[PDB]
């Protein structure tokens, strides 16, 4: 019933991946977001094919 085994610490699968995915997504959304903030994002008539 002892406070040393009444909890586990959090899953370091999710927690340590949180730091990875947060850093990847931020670093993507800002790095991509800086240049995309001028224009570029037409989609449709520029969606891999120009049509």
mmCIF file of C-alpha atoms in Angstrom:
data_model
loop_
_atom_site.group_PDB
_atom_site.id
_atom_site.type_symbol
_atom_site.label_atom_id
_atom_site.label_comp_id
_atom_site.label_asym_id
_atom_site.label_seq_id
_atom_site.Cartn_x
_atom_site.Cartn_y
_atom_site.Cartn_z
ATOM 1 C CA UNK A 1 0.000 0.000 0.000
ATOM 2 C CA UNK A 2 3.289 2.059 0.092
ATOM 3 C CA UNK A 3 3.733 5.490 -1.786
ATOM 4 C CA UNK A 4 6.830 3.913 -3.648
ATOM 5 C CA UNK A 5 4.528 1.488 -5.704
ATOM 6 C CA UNK A 6 1.036 3.299 -5.560
ATOM 7 C CA UNK A 7 1.937 5.122 -8.889
ATOM 8 C CA UNK A 8 4.006 4.421 -11.999
ATOM 9 C CA UNK A 9 5.905 7.300 -13.727
ATOM 10 C CA UNK A 10 4.483 8.328 -17.144
ATOM 11 C CA UNK A 11 5.063 6.236 -20.357
ATOM 12 C CA UNK A 12 8.429 7.540 -21.729
ATOM 13 C CA UNK A 13 7.224 6.102 -25.146
ATOM 14 C CA UNK A 14 4.669 8.949 -25.379
ATOM 15 C CA UNK A 15 6.504 11.575 -23.200
ATOM 16 C CA UNK A 16 9.931 11.486 -24.928
ATOM 17 C CA UNK A 17 8.059 11.266 -28.368
ATOM 18 C CA UNK A 18 6.133 14.341 -27.287
ATOM 19 C CA UNK A 19 9.384 16.340 -27.295
ATOM 20 C CA UNK A 20 10.363 14.854 -30.734
ATOM 21 C CA UNK A 21 6.998 15.417 -32.495
ATOM 22 C CA UNK A 22 6.454 18.868 -30.897
ATOM 23 C CA UNK A 23 9.937 19.906 -31.998
ATOM 24 C CA UNK A 24 9.402 18.447 -35.558
ATOM 25 C CA UNK A 25 5.979 19.894 -36.053
ATOM 26 C CA UNK A 26 6.956 23.376 -34.708
ATOM 27 C CA UNK A 27 10.164 23.470 -36.646
ATOM 28 C CA UNK A 28 8.189 22.427 -39.772
ATOM 29 C CA UNK A 29 5.256 24.763 -39.202
ATOM 30 C CA UNK A 30 7.491 27.784 -38.659
ATOM 31 C CA UNK A 31 10.206 26.897 -41.239
ATOM 32 C CA UNK A 32 7.515 26.145 -43.871
ATOM 33 C CA UNK A 33 5.224 28.897 -42.399
ATOM 34 C CA UNK A 34 7.846 31.710 -42.864
ATOM 35 C CA UNK A 35 8.199 31.273 -46.563
ATOM 36 C CA UNK A 36 4.548 30.246 -47.127
ATOM 37 C CA UNK A 37 3.587 33.572 -45.487
ATOM 38 C CA UNK A 38 4.452 35.494 -48.697
ATOM 39 C CA UNK A 39 2.130 33.645 -51.190
ATOM 40 C CA UNK A 40 2.873 30.176 -52.848
ATOM 41 C CA UNK A 41 -0.261 28.206 -51.391
ATOM 42 C CA UNK A 42 -2.598 28.218 -54.471
ATOM 43 C CA UNK A 43 -3.359 24.385 -54.337
ATOM 44 C CA UNK A 44 -5.909 23.103 -56.910
ATOM 45 C CA UNK A 45 -4.306 24.566 -60.228
ATOM 46 C CA UNK A 46 -0.791 24.021 -58.724
ATOM 47 C CA UNK A 47 -1.460 20.615 -56.936
ATOM 48 C CA UNK A 48 1.582 18.622 -58.207
ATOM 49 C CA UNK A 49 0.104 19.034 -61.669
ATOM 50 C CA UNK A 50 -0.154 22.574 -62.851
ATOM 51 C CA UNK A 51 -3.881 22.423 -64.042
#
